[PDB]
């Protein structure tokens, strides 16, 4: 088996798409193996560029096709090259921009914690013909500053395993294990924008909703509650335009439904305080002691729901 040493340079990770669960990684890949000795011009190593590589492969040079398992489509390969040494050492360096995929969980949306996975595997050669020796990952370009949307936490985590394919038992007996490289990069979201523009004014709106029981009349309370309901609907749409599409409810979504429930509970208490009459003229004040109890009860419900 040929021992291939891979090195992956990550230049930038961006373009996270929550609906399709993809992201875009840009960088280089450097594979290195040892073949037969050869005589190059002089003694210095020989360099083959982008179109010239196909000319050398047609003449019988062995260059394996390394596949990204979780890429969507095909990577946009830029420049690529081969460096052939007279010793017999071959180095294949290429640049990619792919759209990779993973199992991404956005259920805690502003306070999220994802990891970005690249999986690499030979397209055709099992580990009796090509096994990966070692893998170094250089993520020195991606940073941790407040400008960046995602905080990359620590260096990348690497792994080399042997994936077994059970459909090859009919045609390739005893040789169906393929050598796979996995690269994981942990990342934490920047929650500052979503905490200052979305979480806080919704809390202010919900807190200002509770001050309709200071109104003296009853029709004033209902008209004010319906104005607050329109405010909560407008805020729900204001958040739901500027946020990533998801098939489940995030934290912000949980708070919008809490706002709707607060408005409807306020309307129900106003009606029940109005309806407590002997025949239609007897006023009420005992139920309206919830100017300091209903906000606390709703806050306790929310604190239970957070835990």
């Amino acid at each position: 088996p040929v021992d291939v040493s891979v090195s992956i340079f990550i230049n930038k990770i961006y373009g996270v798409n929550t609906l399709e669960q993809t992201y875009k990684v840009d960088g280089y890949i450097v594979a290195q193996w040892t073949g037969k000795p050869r005589k190059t011009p002089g003694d210095k190593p020989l360099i083959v560029e982008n179109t010239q590589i196909e000319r050398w492969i047609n003449n019988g040079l062995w260059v394996p096709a390394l596949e990204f398992i979780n890429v969507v489509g095909s990577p946009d390969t830029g420049n690529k090259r081969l460096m052939l040494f007279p010793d017999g050492r071959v180095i294949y360096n290429a640049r990619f921009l792919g759209s990779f995929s993973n199992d991404m969980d956005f259920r805690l949306f502003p306070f999220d914690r994802q990891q970005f996975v690249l999986e690499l595997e030979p397209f055709s050669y099992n580990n009796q013909q090509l096994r990966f020796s070692d893998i170094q990952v250089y993520t020195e370009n991606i940073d941790n500053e407040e400008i960046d949307e995602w905080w990359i936490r620590g260096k990348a985590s690497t792994h080399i395993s042997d994936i077994r394919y059970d459909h090859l038992s009919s045609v390739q007996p005893n040789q169906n294990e393929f050598s796979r490289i996995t690269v994981r990069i942990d990342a934490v979201r920047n929650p500052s924008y979503y905490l200052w523009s979305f979480i806080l004014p919704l809390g202010l709106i919900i807190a200002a909703s509770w001050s309709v029981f200071w109104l003296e009349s009853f029709s004033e309370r209902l008209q004010t509650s319906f104005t607050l309901m329109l405010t909560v609907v407008a805020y729900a749409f204001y958040t739901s335009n500027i946020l990533p599409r998801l098939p489940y409810t995030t934290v912000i979504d949980q708070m919008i439904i809490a706002g709707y429930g607060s408005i409807f509970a306020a309307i129900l208490l106003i009606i029940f305080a109005h309806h407590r009459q002997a025949n239609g003229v007897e006023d009420d004040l005992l139920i309206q002691r919830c100017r300091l109890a209903f906000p606390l009860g709703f806050l306790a419900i929310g604190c239970v729901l957070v835990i």
Copy 2:
């Protein structure tokens, strides 16, 4: 006729587009047939990569072109390879990302139930020259968890038939049947997001609409009803931005029109209760017993409309 055995691996199904009725499938395809015996280097099977295949076809190798019937455009073929055995067995493995199409019914939108169809057919050879032996479909990567937008229900369903083309009777008599493979994958939508963010607050708004007959005056009722109408219009737009474009009304759309009808019926009852006067000063209370009857009548109408 040459017997070709196909195997389709489905990696992910995503990107469902309701207006154009498309979806995107990513995966592999493995065709396998038996030709003439040959002498390879050694006795081990020979492998041909991506660009090298065109070199072997020019020298006379028979590789059929398998077409996806319902693909839109042309698939984005990534890596592809041929494995040639000295026995005479040929295996063609290729990776695709296509945008397929089907007859999709979204008339029950959140509680939907679709099926994803892939149809495969030789581009040029009828079943007197190429017929499909058997087909295995491996959908082991696509899952059922709550993160996933679509719940894939059970294994895929396969079929091999003979499609007859009547336009070939002029030039190819008695040979116009083509062998076609059909693959169906049933899927159910994740209705949790649409049931918590769209169905429930609309029900709360419509339920809170009925509490305008507790208001004492008449001008208060009209101003409150118009505020509720603006709330329903804002909610209609809030849903209709965040939802898939369709040429027909879904469930959520049916509920928005029910909300408009509830507002207009409330306005009509307020006017008819106001207008019941002898000359302009006689008040009314008999018609305003619909504080507990009109909500029940509207709920009965909605329950009839669901069934």
Copy 3:
């Protein structure tokens, strides 16, 4: 001149873009002509695939380039093939996905009636070297059901004409007529969604606008009219987001302006009924008999504008 017989199969028509006046057609094209006799392997006809065709053209095979006149850009040609008969008959079958263009009129938007045109012409050969014999169009896949956005009315309409180009008189005297094939497919829009979600609640809002003259006071009337004006602006935006961009006003647009005019006329009548005072205290009731006349006058104006 060589007689070429074309057959066009339409698979689906979709993706209508109103601003750029384009649409997307997917399907096949089958051209068939007769050349010189040849000796094929055996007596059976020979098949040439996608890349192999370029090899046969370099050796001197005559394959004309058929151009779509109204395509925008270049079609995304998928698989293509040549079938060469020993008789001398040649059949060229290819698959396309193009973005075609036409002169489209959306001035009656929900109740629209368009036709989709494909124009085909040889790129280089005038009718003294290549004329189109006959053309069959098979639109059997596109349907009429309620799921489909567009109702295709009847079979396609075909035509073969001779287009004359006057700029070729300087370099090609007496030979400047080119043979052109035109294919027209009539289609009617699905108006159900736009009639239930856009036309009807706007009518309900405009009808509920007229019930502000039942209010007793004057400040109540002005505040209520301004609330209705905000409702009409919100509805105008709700429609104008979910509709195709156009450089002219459609029916729905005509109704939005009718709603604005109804609100402004209501405000003008409220002011003129208020202003009819001797010095500032004399009330009015004679002008306020338009609770049953102004709606009828506006409906008559709208009925005149429809006709």
Copy 4:
């Protein structure tokens, strides 16, 4: 120097992008020059198609590369051909779809007046080796009707000049002038949609804003003014979604700010009329004679700002 005669056929101009200042032109280009005499099959001129041209250039045929100077990227070249005459006359016809760029001024947005420029230049040959003889432009397909978004005013305007490049003085002395063709097409926007849907209801809203001084009380005036402010904000967003993104304020934008200023001036006059009290109880009517003066003053300010 070789004299090349160009003819440009414009098929359609569409897809104007205001932010990037681009537009899309589709059409043909026909260059024609005279070379060496040759012997073709027979005496009739010979035709070379799309892929065959590269075969003739490798054998030594001189085909210059004509570049569009202001194209963004590279044009989507469709079919192309060469017609070789035995006289020695060569005609190169090709079809393009490019995304061209210009210095576009949208500061008078609905009543705009732009011109579309195509600049053509040889990529490599200066005017001592290739100079453009004459240029005809055929814009017969683009029209003036009310369906069209842009009204093309008159025939195209053409020009042939000699552009001098000062960076070539180091390596190519006395030969750095290149022959450039410029084509200008004047166009006027269709202002009907923007005048009926955007200019007029904003004028109605601003005119209805002035009728808050007919209200008797003071709190009614403030609540009504704030409702009008919300109406103007909603209208500002309704226009600003459905309009082209620009880095400066257009006419419609000028009118939105005029509406905001009218609302704020109305609020200031209501406050100043309220505040004119001896101690807090003295009413006012002298300042409230601006029910017929403040609208006229604002209209005079707007008429000054238009001029």
Copy 5:
């Protein structure tokens, strides 16, 4: 080492994408080095076009591959050419359209100040085989007028350095320094649109918010404050649709939160002025002297926050 002289012509810089931190540069690149003398046809220099260059490289011509380090993907190379002199001087001219990337800071959004960076480096040759002699940058096409979105301040700034790669110490000892060219272009945003459409009406809305303490009653104050809160939410959404997506709060965002805080502080002062009662009937005027103090305090807070 071969001395290569680069010249970069910038045609336009556009398409700035704030989320992915990219921009698009269009222009030319002219590299020039000196090789071996050769015999061309005649004595005039020879020109090689777009497809012909690959033919000359296969025969052994040395053309280095110059890479853009910060490009995303691969540039859309249009026309390219080689000019070969009999002296031995080689000139490689090519046209690119790339999507470059940089570390962009939009934290002061309308009053921004960015710089656009292009980095150029040989793909394979270290500075013992290829070092960059000098670099001229011609930005004569990009301007400073008010039509342009970005004001380019002064000429471009150039630099030539030696980047050292530490991963090459294992296979290429003592030769791992690569010659890199950096080009920086400073640019200032056009703040006029954002200052007239976004900053000023928000200031008018916030200033008009302070005039709710002129209202006499208490329920009027609360209803008016909630109407103002809905106005601020609608304005927040109106700005946040028409602005670039960012992971942090800009100036406009800071002002929206200031508006929310002003509304909530106004509500708190109205409640605290209402609540100052002995048992529920004692009115208040001492706290309501903040009709001229609370606006000044909020303005002082904002002026502190600006500094």
